[PDB]
Amino acid sequence: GSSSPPSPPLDLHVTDAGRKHIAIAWKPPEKNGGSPIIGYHVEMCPVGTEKWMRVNSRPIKDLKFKVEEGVVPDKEYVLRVRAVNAIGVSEPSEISENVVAKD
């Protein structure tokens, strides 16, 4: 009965990882808040820090993403995803399981 950013993406999980990539997938927000979801953003943070960094250049128009930018081999990360609509940016998803950039 009002207009808001979307609720957060759901069910974020890691599908694959390597020394140079972390592949993730998620499910759409339960609610779009009153205007369609137009994109997703992925953030990455080395575990034990609060140094969240956006790892996509353009809005993601899919429910999966291969993270490559800024991945450091043998570092350990968590990820989170945000949804965007014409009102603004969602709070982030629940964070991912911990993932090491190794094979």
Author numbering: 1 to 103
Quote the study that presented this structure, word for word:
Titin is a protein expressed in the skeletal and cardiac, or striated, muscle of vertebrates that plays various roles in muscle structure and function. Encoded by the gene TTN, titin spans half a sarcomere (the basic contractile unit of muscle) and has various functions including preventing sarcomere over-extension (Gautel and Djinović-Carugo, 2016), acting as a molecular ruler for thick filament formation and as a hub for numerous signalling molecules (Kruger and Linke, 2011, Linke and Hamdani, 2014). Fn3 domains are only found in the A-band region of titin, where they are arranged with Ig domains in a pattern termed super-repeats, which themselves are repeated. Fn3 domains have a characteristic beta sandwich fold, with a core of hydrophobic residues as the “filling” between two beta sheets that pack against each other face-to-face.
Fn3-3 and Fn3-11 are found in the non-repetitive region of A-band titin near the tip of the thick filament, Fn3-20 is in the second D-zone super-repeat and Fn3-49, Fn3-56, Fn3-85 and Fn3-90 are located in the 1st, 2nd, 6th and 7th C-zone super-repeats, respectively. Structural predictions of the three variant domains suggest little change to the backbone trace of the proteins and that no clashes would be introduced upon mutation. All domains with variants from HCM patients were solubly expressed in bacteria (data not shown), however Fn3-11 Ala16872Pro was unfolded as evidenced by 1D NMR and its decrease in elution volume (and increased hydrodynamic radius) compared to WT in size exclusion chromatography. We also characterised the effects of three further rare missense variants found in patients with HCM: Fn3-11 Ala16872Pro renders its domain unfolded (contrary to the predicted domain structure) but is still solubly expressed in bacteria, whilst Fn3-85 Ser27083Pro and Fn3-90 Arg27839Gln do not affect the folding of their domain but reduce its thermal stability. The negative effects of Ala16872Pro on Fn3-11 are easier to rationalise as it renders the domain unfolded, though soluble. For two variants identified in congenital myopathy patients, we have previously shown that missense variants that render the domain misfolded and insoluble when expressed in bacteria also do the same when expressed in cardiac and skeletal cells, giving no reason to suggest expressing Fn3-11Ala16872Pro in mammalian cells would “rescue” folding of the domain via chaperone-mediated folding.
